[PDB]
Design a protein around this ligand. Structure first.
Ligand SMILES: NC(=O)C1=CN([C@@H]2O[C@H](COP(=O)(O)OP(=O)(O)OC[C@H]3O[C@@H](n4cnc5c(N)ncnc54)[C@H](OP(=O)(O)O)[C@@H]3O)[C@@H](O)[C@H]2O)C=CC1
Ligand SMILES: NC(=O)C1=CN([C@@H]2O[C@H](COP(=O)(O)OP(=O)(O)OC[C@H]3O[C@@H](n4cnc5c(N)ncnc54)[C@H](OP(=O)(O)O)[C@@H]3O)[C@@H](O)[C@H]2O)C=CC1
Ligand SMILES: NC(=O)C1=CN([C@@H]2O[C@H](COP(=O)(O)OP(=O)(O)OC[C@H]3O[C@@H](n4cnc5c(N)ncnc54)[C@H](OP(=O)(O)O)[C@@H]3O)[C@@H](O)[C@H]2O)C=CC1
Ligand SMILES: NC(=O)C1=CN([C@@H]2O[C@H](COP(=O)(O)OP(=O)(O)OC[C@H]3O[C@@H](n4cnc5c(N)ncnc54)[C@H](OP(=O)(O)O)[C@@H]3O)[C@@H](O)[C@H]2O)C=CC1
Ligand SMILES: N=C(N)Nc1nc2cc(Cl)c(Cl)cc2[nH]1
Ligand SMILES: N=C(N)Nc1nc2cc(Cl)c(Cl)cc2[nH]1
Ligand SMILES: N=C(N)Nc1nc2cc(Cl)c(Cl)cc2[nH]1
Ligand SMILES: N=C(N)Nc1nc2cc(Cl)c(Cl)cc2[nH]1
Lengths: 251, 250, 249, 251
């Protein structure tokens, strides 16, 4: 009866809010994680406590490598294994850190992590998702509203997010004859990085015209839920910016 | 106590579907109209039958002129007179016809109607709305195909691009008042009444998702989302509702 | 046999530099002006001193009104009257001032900001096309229109509209071999009434060299677009902004 | 005192025209190539017969791999070894082929080739170029004007080109303090695929408003020349579309 959603990097933060909101809307959910095993299991527990057999976890590294296609296949397989179907895919998992052009991680590792999580893994997941569907089927990609006014020294990350815009459009066109919609949600400033100091957090928050506040995880989730809902049945290839006006502010 | 909305060009088609959906959501509505007096009054009547005195009509030419500022002030006024508040403005009214560059409205009428309805009136409405001012927002009806325009529709396209500009500029400026400003960009929706059946079929068949134009209710859906509590962080955004049409190459 | 260009608002600043650079390239030029009669005449003088009979002035208000179509037609006529042809149009003239949402009447703001930045370019385009080699139009856009200054909504509306005209006219005039393109400055020559400390604020924002573009730098891009080196380019807008539009809040 | 340029994939077609035109402008050139050895040496020969000691060849696979960073550093090194300097990088080399989302290269190979050539290698070349400069320095990336209205089934290619737009912007921002400009040139339809039949070629030619024909390689090179010239001293982070109005034509 109930549709089933896969959410990547769903253990914490925005991806958790999305998994929660999908669950509250009646979805069964695959909680994908990489390092956050305890959080993922804890979330799956809460959801199962609310409804029996409605949440499973699935562990996978989404770094680019020659086995990434098999890992992605396996994420989609774990949703069919648990729930017998897979209606929604949310590409939320993301690596995010600077990669300066001028000088622990080798550059090969930087490439693999930032391009793999942000772009190639969404692409292989999309292929695996579609191959299983070869109903209200959709994919939502977590993009970035600030990619055209990027932070200094974030070239690879920005390349990955721009690539994900490219995938959003190319997959929307190609999957439309199957009824599969493909769209994006582009946060500006949301939950700030765990490592960022309170003072820097404050600087970022106050750049936002609408209320001088970061978007809550729930606010982002609200846009995701809109895109997968019957209220968006004609929307595909669209990216909804959710940024409180941040991208409109000049230097 | 219920919120109130103005919807321009609300007598028929997309504007009517927005008005109805806002009304169904619990809004009181001003149905603005220009020539479609029977349809406008009839719609308001049906809404009032559903809930007493929850709909008013207001007629106004949104052609650019030295009287346009007052007319736009009067529309916003009408909402405050009827309902004592104005929470939502939907700039939906729009002129749409060819204005070839190389050669019976005079070109100055074409200018006044296409730039007035699509851009200047939204601007003056936005001014009046903001001037009079806890979930306030403006939704501008844009056009997903503005970067791949139909041949000979320069003034129309100029208007819709100006409307994108307005959405962004007004989002920035009005954010300190809590007024969100967003847009909804249809691709092909209800086709022009004038358009021949063959041309209509040529458009719908180009749409990747379903080979069908959007229903008026599908557009209204996105408007509803933008005015809703589910979009409280969204401002300066334009949501394309086009079934993937703008993605299709020549 | 020398081709001819119209440049609107060519008496001073960027338009002056564009008229001068086109002239140095070998064009005969119509120097359009509104209030700057003395400056326009000096320029025509300097240019004709270099090559006899190669520059004329043409006065016109480019405020929106029911006669704007005729004034625009007259600017193109002035090129044909002087030079017997019109090869290039540069839409440069522009009103720029704030128009907050919350002693010019709003209707005057609309007419000046939308007429100069958009409607007059449209009507000049129609007149240019109606008269019709390396034919092209260049529109002076704005690189910052998606991250606009506070309180400039009419100006931004005009500049967005001009992008739309650039694309629509490029599409419609291509079958005539007329190319239509844009040049989008960021910070260039700073507004005459700006204080030095404020100028300096805008300079420090520019990644490439922490300075504004010279007028000549803007003119360089125009020159490119009108040249035989840009023969396949139409519907393009070149940003000339030193990376300003890439800088976040 | 003659400046020097690297052009990738410069043996044939557009990259060849770029190399020729830079040389004609007075640059010394490194002609990078992958498989087209005969064409590359043949071009080096012509250029040298015009001015001695002004053209060399450099062979490298630009496929993504853990060896790609070394290969890229080596290409830039080639220009220092031969010419003592490196003023201009043009990232022209590109793989281009369909990658259906729904089903004889493996998916891993398709990723490596399409994301490597179109994005990763440009990023790594850009690091190596920049590291050396830590005068009129600039990079030109060959983009694609049709990236927002993409051909069916070219997901990875489009991801690659979108990433390359991201690079262009990120790198323009990050390298501006060194005086290095970073810009792009976005052909529409230019030299048609060698493997495309004359009937399909004419189909594409007919779509182009400006003259109903593809751009010549020389027309594309013209734009690169402008961007590298002193006529573009203030231009960085810009992409010039060279497409004859193609991207303006609706479905
Ligand atoms: N937060 C913000 O301000 C903004 C967010 N966004 C986008 O929104 C989305 C959610 O953001 P946010 O919640 O902050 O994301 P996080 O930075 O918290 O990343 C979410 C999850 O991604 C997973 N992940 C990271 N690297 C890998 C990897 N190599 N393989 C597998 N999974 C991996 C992690 O899983 P685990 O912990 O289990 O290892 C992590 O918890 C992202 O796509 C992001 O780029 C865009 C703009 C701003
Ligand atoms: N339909 C579609 O496929 C598409 C629609 N859109 C946009 O969506 C919105 C709604 O579309 P749609 O329902 O088709 O619009 P219509 O063409 O039906 O126009 C809506 C209303 O605008 C009003 N209007 C026209 N001229 C004037 C004027 N001078 N003064 C005042 N009002 C005027 C009319 O009121 P009255 O009838 O009372 O005179 C008309 O009913 C518009 O902004 C449109 O551009 C965008 C892309 C495609
Ligand atoms: N300067 C900058 O930093 C930037 C410039 N731009 C764009 O580049 C172009 C040139 O900028 P800039 O040189 O500073 O321009 P100016 O503000 O100096 O204006 C150029 C000319 O426009 C003419 N003009 C103004 N109003 C009217 C009118 N109603 N009718 C006719 N002509 C009129 C004036 O002519 P007169 O003096 O004869 O009355 C004026 O000299 C403009 O399009 C501008 O928007 C874009 C971004 C930044
Ligand atoms: N032609 C057109 O119509 C259009 C072109 N463009 C862009 O313009 C640029 C030039 O186009 P075009 O000349 O047609 O390009 P080609 O398709 O002819 O490819 C250029 C060169 O790329 C090199 N290349 C391909 N794969 C690899 C690899 N794995 N490692 C190293 N080098 C490799 C090849 O070198 P070799 O032959 O030595 O093996 C090839 O000759 C490209 O970036 C392209 O995407 C954009 C839009 C349309
Ligand atoms: N945590 C992430 N995966 N992505 C992320 N985190 C981000 C934080 C900010 Cl301040 C911005 Cl402008 C963009 C960001 N993207
Ligand atoms: N009816 C209007 N006012 N606007 C409108 N009507 C439109 C019809 C189409 Cl076929 C497209 Cl492409 C854009 C349109 N915009
Ligand atoms: N003077 C004009 N006509 N236009 C103009 N002048 C401008 C000055 C700035 Cl500092 C920016 Cl950001 C945009 C501008 N546009
Ligand atoms: N050959 C390449 N490497 N790239 C390339 N070749 C192309 C050919 C076309 Cl007719 C299009 Cl619309 C885009 C192209 N991109």
């Amino acid at each position: 009866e109930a549709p089933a959603a896969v959410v990547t990097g769903a253990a914490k933060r925005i991806g958790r809010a999305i998994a929660v909101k999908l669950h509250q809307t009646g979805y069964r959910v695959v909680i994908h994680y990489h390092n956050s095993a305890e959080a993922a299991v804890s979330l799956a527990d809460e959801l199962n406590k609310e409804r029996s057999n409605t949440a499973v976890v699935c562990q996978a590294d989404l770094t680019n490598s020659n086995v990434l296609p098999a890992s992605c296949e396996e994420i989609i397989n774990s949703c069919f294994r648990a729930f017998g179907r897979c209606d929604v895919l949310v590409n939320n998992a993301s690596a995010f850190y600077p990669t300066p052009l001028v000088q622990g991680k080798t550059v090969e590792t930087q490439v693999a992590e930032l391009i793999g999580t942000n772009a190639i893994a969404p692409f292989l997941l999309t292929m695996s998702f579609a191959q299983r569907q070869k109903s209200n089927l959709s994919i939502v990609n977590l993009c970035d509203a600030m990619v055209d006014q990027p932070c200094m020294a974030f070239s690879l990350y920005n390349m990955g997010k721009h690539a994900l815009v490219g995938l959003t459009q190319s997959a929307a066109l190609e999957l439309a004859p199957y009824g599969i919609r493909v769209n994006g949600v582009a946060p500006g400033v949301s939950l700030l990085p765990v490592a960022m100091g309170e003072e820097e957090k404050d600087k970022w928050r106050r750049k936002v015209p609408l209320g001088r506040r970061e978007a809550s995880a729930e606010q982002i989730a609200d846009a995701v839920i809109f895109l997968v809902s019957g209220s968006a049945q004609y929307i595909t290839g669209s990216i909804i910016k959710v940024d409180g006006g941040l991208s409109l502010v000049h230097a």
